[PDB]
Amino acid sequence: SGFRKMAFPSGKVEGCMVQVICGTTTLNGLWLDDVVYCPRHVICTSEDMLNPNYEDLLIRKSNHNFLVQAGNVQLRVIGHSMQNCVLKLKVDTANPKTPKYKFVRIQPGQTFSVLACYNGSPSGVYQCAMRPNFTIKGSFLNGSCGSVGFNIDYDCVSFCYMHHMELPTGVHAGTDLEGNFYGPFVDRQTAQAAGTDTTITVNVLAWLYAAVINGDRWFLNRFTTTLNDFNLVAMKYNYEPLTQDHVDILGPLSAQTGIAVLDMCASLKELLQNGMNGRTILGSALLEDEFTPFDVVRQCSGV
């Protein structure tokens, strides 16, 4: 027992991280088979980022202008292409450590592990979620660009995120591995405001199920509610509206605990209206929304 914000083991992704240098700019790339993926603003200086024309800046770059280094082994760049906001650097060596992988574009509210890297070397791993406003609340310092987010199923790494930007508010924006940004953000150093950071209701409920499984039960009450009645309260507290698809996703946790989804909603409603009264749930004094239903199942069964 016990419940922890847990990332996926990072070793499969460590074996894919490389350093990419273009002129004066150094960031991280992801080396899968014979392609290195990295943010296209590797070709920019800080002055360029105010108003970049990437197609024009790219004309001045040749294969030899991109230096790629996997620890100490230097990779020879034999072709390069821009796909949306990523550069694909074709190299002469297939990565021997390439795991089974997929590129997936996740939905808001889904979670994933980030391997924070600098200069091509991993520094740490942590779990976060794609917020409903399409930011993530990460830990990224200068040079972390090109660090990736991923999920793992058995032996297959699903890459879902590559870090590109820190907004002036300190939250983070990036792309999928096809180079499309999540949300409205762009790779330019301009004013970009996020949008309302709403809470991921279905994740809060899953975490409340996790709490029950682990013995934290004080928040269970005698009331129930309805989908429409709960959502009226959800709207007031900037919570995402809960749908029947969400109720269904919560089915297995409902079954294991014998607590109807709607009864748990009534516990959360009371928690939103009355606060925690200085108590904690699973060691937190606020409602946690970075565990999906699948995350809770995975950790509570030891997948």
Add this chain to the structure above:
Amino acid sequence: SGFRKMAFPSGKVEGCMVQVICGTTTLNGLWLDDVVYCPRHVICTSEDMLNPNYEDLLIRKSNHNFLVQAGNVQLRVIGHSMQNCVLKLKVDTANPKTPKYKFVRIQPGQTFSVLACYNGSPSGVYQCAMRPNFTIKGSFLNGSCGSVGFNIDYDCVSFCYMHHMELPTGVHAGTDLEGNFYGPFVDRQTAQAAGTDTTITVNVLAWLYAAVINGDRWFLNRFTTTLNDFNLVAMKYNYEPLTQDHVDILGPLSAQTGIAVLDMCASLKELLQNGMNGRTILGSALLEDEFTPFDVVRQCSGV
């Protein structure tokens, strides 16, 4: 910017995890060079755990009674020895993936990464701390025994923890890699009470420094205090007493922020006496004590 509970990259330790089976019991082992380390209660059944005599139970076990499997490669056991509460299984193959490593016995309040494993396969990684009462608040289900905790410096893995027990209160106890338990705990299924879970004061202060560096400043006040005056408040709130060694360890964070250690203590004092008033610090509604001063420096400089 941004600040996250971050674990070390786990790949160096994934390459060392093996499955150990003795009769009907399966747990995890750690394969370094030609030795597999695992909890000695691999030789016990659940009935044995009520009152085990390990020396007597071990007489009935021969080299061939221990099955060791690294993914799919079966390791041949050629010798075995009990060292305190661990078994050292000598095998015929040195682990090709053995990293540079050390065995270290950490102090209370120090943090480390846990690679949770089941049946020899990693399931996740998270950061925790050795509590002052020598428990850890982990996430361990049946069969996670033998999962290890570690720190990494450049290329050297310092192993500091191996999981052995879940106490009836749901917290966790284990050994260093020499098989000595942290704290008074023993590998027997009996009543074992932890002790007062005090808060790691020096870690709270470091995290407050982290908060300032990242723009969370509302808790800074106009007061100061003294070591003795603060500690009077620390005692009341079951906080560890703060020493001059702790003030010194906080020196670099004091220097970077220009906030004297004692002024930060006065902010924490006000926070303990008045609560957070429903505010958050770095996304937490309670005072976080699982970041050491070194953790904060590492993450704020991108080591």
